[PDB]
Design a binder for this molecule. Sequence first.
Ligand SMILES: O=C(O)[C@@H](Cc1c[nH]c2ccccc12)NS(=O)(=O)c1ccc(-c2ccc(I)cc2)cc1
Ligand SMILES: [Ca+2]
Ligand SMILES: [Ca+2]
Ligand SMILES: [Ca+2]
Ligand SMILES: [Ca+2]
Ligand SMILES: [Cl-]
Ligand SMILES: [Cl-]
Ligand SMILES: [Cl-]
Ligand SMILES: [Cl-]
Ligand SMILES: [Zn+2]
Ligand SMILES: [Zn+2]
Length: 159
Amino acid sequence: FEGDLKWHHHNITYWIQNYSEDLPRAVIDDAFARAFALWSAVTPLTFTRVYSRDADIVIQFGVAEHGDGYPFDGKDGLLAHAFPPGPGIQGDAHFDDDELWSLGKGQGYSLFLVAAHQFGHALGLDHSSVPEALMYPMYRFTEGPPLHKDDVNGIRHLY
Ligand SMILES: O=C(O)[C@@H](Cc1c[nH]c2ccccc12)NS(=O)(=O)c1ccc(-c2ccc(I)cc2)cc1
Ligand SMILES: [Ca+2]
Ligand SMILES: [Ca+2]
Ligand SMILES: [Ca+2]
Ligand SMILES: [Ca+2]
Ligand SMILES: [Cl-]
Ligand SMILES: [Cl-]
Ligand SMILES: [Cl-]
Ligand SMILES: [Cl-]
Ligand SMILES: [Zn+2]
Ligand SMILES: [Zn+2]
């Protein structure tokens, strides 16, 4: 899931294909919108929700085998993955619905934080070595702005 390509356009589109059973559709839509807003806040990139497969980033929740050659392992383990910039499945973000999706403090994984992380991958970003960075390879819930100086620098170095 490591690429070397970047999007050749800044007006990125995304489509929420389906939803998780853990949260209301309104909460889901809002969580993704806010996740994208983190990246558009520090770059000339924009994110527009669409309802077509022609979208750059197709978002979907799946369980076990879901099309690609990387099935989800169910509870825990892989939480989700996003393919780097490119056509087709590239740029798409998949979330393991066998995981408990929630927000803020408490049990379950924050869909907001995991999505922001995945969108980083969808934009071409690789894992960061900075523990406090959103692109850190390890999930850990914390309060405060998700983007660390390292995340901002990385994304701006691309766009
Ligand atoms: O890192 C990921 O995107 C996925 C997929 C993956 C597995 N190995 C690699 C290697 C390189 C890129 C992606 C992946 N691994 S994951 O275990 O599902 C995972 C996803 C997100 C996060 C994460 C979310 C939010 C914060 I803040 C920090 C890490 C940690 C671990
Ligand atoms: Ca902006
Ligand atoms: Ca795509
Ligand atoms: Ca899993
Ligand atoms: Ca779930
Ligand atoms: Cl659905
Ligand atoms: Cl927010
Ligand atoms: Cl959160
Ligand atoms: Cl932020
Ligand atoms: Zn997948
Ligand atoms: Zn990652």
